[PDB]
Glutathione S-transferase GliG (Neosartorya fumigata), 478 residues
Amino acid sequence: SERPSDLVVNRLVLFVVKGTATSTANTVKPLILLEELGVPHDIYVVEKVSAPWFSEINPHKMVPAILDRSPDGRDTLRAWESTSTLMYIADAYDKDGTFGGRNVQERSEINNWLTLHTAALGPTAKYWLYFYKLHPEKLPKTIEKLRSNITVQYDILERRLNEPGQQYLALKDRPTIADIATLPFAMKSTAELFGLEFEKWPKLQEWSVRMGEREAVKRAWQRVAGFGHGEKEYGMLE
Amino acid sequence: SMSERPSDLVVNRLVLFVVKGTATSTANTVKPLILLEELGVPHDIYVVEKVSAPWFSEINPHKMVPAILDRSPDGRDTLRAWESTSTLMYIADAYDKDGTFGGRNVQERSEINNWLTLHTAALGPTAKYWLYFYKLHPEKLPKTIEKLRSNITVQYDILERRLNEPGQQYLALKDRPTIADIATLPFAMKSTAELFGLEFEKWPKLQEWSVRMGEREAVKRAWQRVAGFGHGEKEYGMLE
């Protein structure tokens, strides 16, 4: 119909935009999981999220989005909303439940902390960033209240990581899609952007550093910054 | 622990934590209750007097209803669910073994999670922030209230477009309602639209969908029960 010629779905295709300091907070999430699990995937750099062909993939017209083959390879499926892309990759490629949860007990906590980010810190940070930069008029009282609500979320995450042996948000033993979803909005660089002293949440800061030291996380940050700055600017990367 | 539970809080089955039924207290707690009614899951109702009570904050650190305590599958331990979307995920995982509401395969689940997460991330928080700034915030911020109201119409537009697709009777799947539909319904029905100061008739397929969902016996039972909690023989604690 209206898809670009280079949009081929032979394996998982992760839709992103050109890498900047402000454009990668959400697209890095599925990329971290793909790197952790070693999932074969392509990167598609979307020039215009407003493009009609892209709205048929994601009606919310934002990155990240995924196109992928169905398990039997006879059909195509889609994932959109960053949390949904994490849930999809876990469902399709994490059958052992290393990042998705191995049992009902593990999944119960993973979904609690994943949903907390999806419903509270995620949208609050999104609205803060909107009213701070994007909104034509400046509403500083609304900006301050959203800033305050971020500290309330940081307080909840700090208290969780102060529980005995609770090294990660969901599970004590290893990171999950809950940790991956939270990390971009709960690290020193993002705290400085909000105008907050991240040192006020010591266990949360320690957690962000521990997550940051993971090879998959380092590779994901490096790659997501680079997308659209290579020999090919837009479309399917080589 | 540092907090003591009430003597009447025992977990012999799934316990759904709610507050006294009011116009503004039921929009989230009704979601897991709809799914419990659909699947015929044996459950208790616990009416929370004070969501800031230490014992309840140890169940849900976000200090809100709904929350769930349940026995682990083997019945040796207890587990918890909190955030209304997380409670739907948990009930589906533990009790929807044939995937009727949770999705039967990766393909069904891919769409269910898309529309479930859209609500959890977009309409849900936007509606909550509108409600906050409208009647909870000490000061009136009309420019903020206006933008949030505008953002609700954009979300209604997305749902309307989806339900205008050929044979798309429900948000995620064409054939049947899922946890995606259950999560969305309370924020996409006429009474809630009228609360936002919007004309719900302007989204006709979304209105038809909300009526179709509303005609389900499980949904009718859930709405009746959630309004009545804490107004029966017992005001607070474990209901009979």
